[PDB]
C-alpha cells in the first residue's frame, strides 16, 4: 500500500512535502557551505608522505610577519617617495615614469590603511568586554551557584549597546575580507582611479620642484 522507494527531490517545493521526502521532520535552512575555505582539491594522496617535517614553531614564526597589527611605524614607509633630484637619458626617463606609479599605489594603500586601523581600535576594545563577560560566567560553573549577578546583568547590556551603536559605522563588508583573483577583476589598482592618482602625484611633484 505504501511507497517502498525514495522520491527524488525537486526545486521550489513545499516544506511539508520536503519533510515527507526526508521523513526526518526538520532540516537546516542554510547549508553554511559558503563559509567553507574551498572544496578539497580531489587529488590522490596515497603518495608517500615526506619524511622530514618542519616544526610548527618555525612555520608560525615564518607567517607571523604577515599579520602583525598596523602601526604608524609602517604608515611612514608608504607616504615616502625618496630622492628626486640627484638621478636626473633612457634610464632617467624610466625612473621618472616608474616613481609616479609607485606613489599612486602607495597613496591608495594609505587610503585603505586608515579604515583598517579604525576597525582595529574598535576590535581591541570589543575583545576586552567579550573576555570579561566570558570570564564572569565561568565562576558560576565553578561555584555551581542562584540569581544572575548584577555585574553579569550589566555587562551584557554594555556589550549589546556598544555593538549595535558603534559597529554600524563599520558595516561595510570589505573591512575584513581579502579580495580573491577567482572572483574576476578585483584588483584594487583599477585604471579608472590610477589615472587620477597619477595626475595628483604629478601635480605634487611639480609643486615640490617649484618650491625646491
Amino acid at each position: 500500500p505504501t511507497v517502498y522507494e525514495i522520491r527524488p527531490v525537486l526545486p521550489g517545493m513545499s516544506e511539508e512535502e520536503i519533510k515527507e521526502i526526508y521523513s526526518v521532520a526538520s532540516y537546516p535552512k542554510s547549508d553554511l557551505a559558503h563559509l567553507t575555505c574551498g572544496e578539497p582539491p580531489d587529488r590522490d594522496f596515497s603518495n608517500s608522505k615526506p619524511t622530514n617535517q618542519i616544526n610548527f614553531s618555525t612555520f608560525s614564526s615564518y607567517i607571523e610577519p604577515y599579520f602583525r597589527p598596523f602601526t604608524e611605524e609602517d604608515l611612514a614607509f608608504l607616504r615616502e617617495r625618496g630622492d628626486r633630484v640627484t638621478p636626473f637619458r633612457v634610464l632617467q626617463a624610466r625612473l621618472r615614469e616608474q616613481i609616479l606609479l609607485n606613489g599612486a599605489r602607495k597613496a591608495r594603500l594609505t587610503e585603505l590603511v586608515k579604515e583598517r586601523m579604525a576597525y582595529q581600535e574598535y576590535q581591541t576594545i570589543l575583545e576586552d568586554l567579550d573576555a570579561q563577560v566570558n570570564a564572569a560566567y565561568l565562576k558560576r560553573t565553578r561555584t555551581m551557584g542562584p540569581g544572575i549577578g548584577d555585574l553579569a546583568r550589566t555587562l551584557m547590556d554594555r556589550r549589546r549597546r556598544w555593538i549595535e551603536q558603534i559597529g554600524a559605522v563599520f558595516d561595510d563588508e570589505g573591512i575584513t575580507k581579502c579580495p580573491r583573483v577567482e572572483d574576476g577583476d578585483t584588483s584594487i589598482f583599477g585604471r579608472e582611479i590610477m589615472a587620477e592618482l597619477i595626475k595628483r602625484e604629478k601635480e605634487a611633484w611639480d609643486e615640490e620642484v617649484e618650491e625646491e
Binding site: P40, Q98, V181
Partner: protein, 339 residues
C-alpha cells in the same frame, strides 16, 4: 548461541534433520515426532510410533531452481532469513549462513540482480506462481549432481588453496601528508588553530532541559540569555579562524622551500625592502602583490643603474626587451603589463 533459529533433532537417532529430507508421523498419538529418512528407511521406531498402520508425511528439502539457475529454494529462503537476522547489508555472515561456498561478492551480485536491480518490483518473478517453466526445464537429478560436483571441486580447491596472507597494519590515513607536520590538506584544517583555547569556555556548558522561554514573561530567562551570549563570541572566533585560513591559502604561504630559496637568491637591500612591504599582503590579491613588489625592485634597480644582477643587466650593451616602451602611455593610463 547468538543465532535465533530453531535446531531440529530426530526423536530416535538424535540426528539433525533440519537441512535434510525427513518424514514425520502423522498420527495424533505422535506429536512433532520426526523420523529421518534412514530411521524411516531402517524403520527404527520409538514411543508410540507405528510404521505399520499409521500414515506418514514426507518432508521435502525443496531442491530445485525458482529464480536463479544456480540457486534453489533453500538457498533463497536462507538468504532472506539471514537478511531478517543478520541485517540487510551484512554480506559476510549471510553468505556464511547460506552455504555452498558462495563468496560475499557472489551473494551480493545475486541479490542485487534478482531483487533490487531487476526487471522486477517487490512482487517477485515474472507474473505469478503460474509460471512453471524453470522447474520443468531442468530435472532435479541433474541440478543436484551439478551442486555436488561444484561443492566437491570447491572443497578440493579450498583444501589446496594457498594460505591467506596476514593482514598488514591498517592503512592509517595519517592526514599529516603535507610537508608541514600537522597539516591536513585533505581537510583544510590545522591541528593548532589561531585560538585553540577558545573552546576552553564552552566545554563544560550545560542547558536546563526543556527550557528556552519564560512561562510568564515570554522573554529568555536571565541565565538563558547569559548562556547564549557566551557562544556568540565562540562563533566570532571561528569566523576569525576561517578568514585566517582563507588569507593563508592565497599567496601560496604553504611552500616553505620555494619561498626561502627565492629570498636566499635575493640580495640584501631587496630582501630588506620586501620584508618591510610584507604586511600589506592581506589587502591585495596575488597579482597585485607581485606587481607592487616587482615595481619596488624595478625602481631600486633603476636607481642603482643610474649570475649578473639587475643593475648589471640594465647597463648591458643591449637593453632588455621590457624597457623600450613607456610604462604609462601619453594619456596617463598605465600599460596593462606594468610589472
Amino acid at each position: 548461541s547468538g543465532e535465533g533459529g530453531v535446531k531440529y533433532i530426530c526423536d530416535v537417532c538424535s540426528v539433525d534433520i533440519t537441512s535434510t529430507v525427513r518424514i514425520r508421523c502423522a498420527d495424533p498419538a505422535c506429536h512433532d515426532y520426526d523420523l529421518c529418512v534412514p530411521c524411516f528407511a531402517n524403520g527404527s521406531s520409538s514411543n508410540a510410533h507405528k510404521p505399520a498402520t499409521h500414515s506418514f508425511r514426507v518432508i521435502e528439502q525443496n531442491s530445485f531452481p525458482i529464480f536463479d539457475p544456480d540457486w534453489g529454494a533453500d538457498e533463497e529462503l536462507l538468504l532472506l532469513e539471514g537478511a531478517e537476522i543478520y541485517g540487510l547489508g551484512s554480506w559476510a555472515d549471510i553468505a556464511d549462513h547460506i552455504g555452498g561456498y558462495r563468496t560475499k561478492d557472489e551473494v551480493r551480485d545475486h541479490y542485487l540482480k534478482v531483487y533490487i536491480e531487476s526487471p522486477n518490483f517487490p512482487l517477485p518473478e515474472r507474473c505469478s506462481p503460474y509460471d512453471l517453466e524453470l522447474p520443468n526445464s531442468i530435472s532435479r537429478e541433474e541440478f543436484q549432481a551439478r551442486k555436488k560436483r561444484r561443492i566437491e571441486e570447491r572443497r578440493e580447491a579450498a583444501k589446496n588453496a594457498p594460505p591467506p596472507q596476514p593482514k598488514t597494519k591498517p592503512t592509517a590515513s595519517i592526514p599529516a601528508c603535507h610537508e608541514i607536520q600537522g597539516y591536513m590538506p585533505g581537510r583544510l584544517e590545522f591541528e593548532t588553530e589561531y585560538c585553540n583555547e577558545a573552546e576552553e569556555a564552552v566545554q563544560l556548558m550545560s542547558f536546563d532541559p526543556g527550557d528556552g522561554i519564560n512561562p510568564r514573561t515570554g522573554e529568555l530567562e536571565p541565565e538563558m540569555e547569559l548562556k547564549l551570549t557566551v557562544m556568540e563570541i565562540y562563533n566570532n572566533r571561528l569566523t576569525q579562524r576561517v578568514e585566517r585560513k582563507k588569507v593563508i591559502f592565497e599567496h601560496n604561504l604553504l611552500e616553505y622551500r620555494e619561498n626561502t630559496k627565492a629570498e636566499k637568491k635575493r640580495s640584501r637591500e631587496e630582501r630588506e625592502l620586501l620584508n618591510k612591504a610584507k604586511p600589506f599582503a592581506r589587502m591585495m590579491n596575488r597579482h597585485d602583490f607581485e606587481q607592487f613588489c616587482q615595481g619596488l625592485i624595478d625602481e631600486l634597480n633603476l636607481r642603482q643603474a643610474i649570475p649578473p644582477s639587475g643593475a648589471a643587466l640594465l647597463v648591458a650593451p643591449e637593453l632588455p626587451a621590457r624597457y623600450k616602451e613607456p610604462i604609462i602611455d601619453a594619456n596617463g593610463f598605465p600599460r596593462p603589463d606594468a610589472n
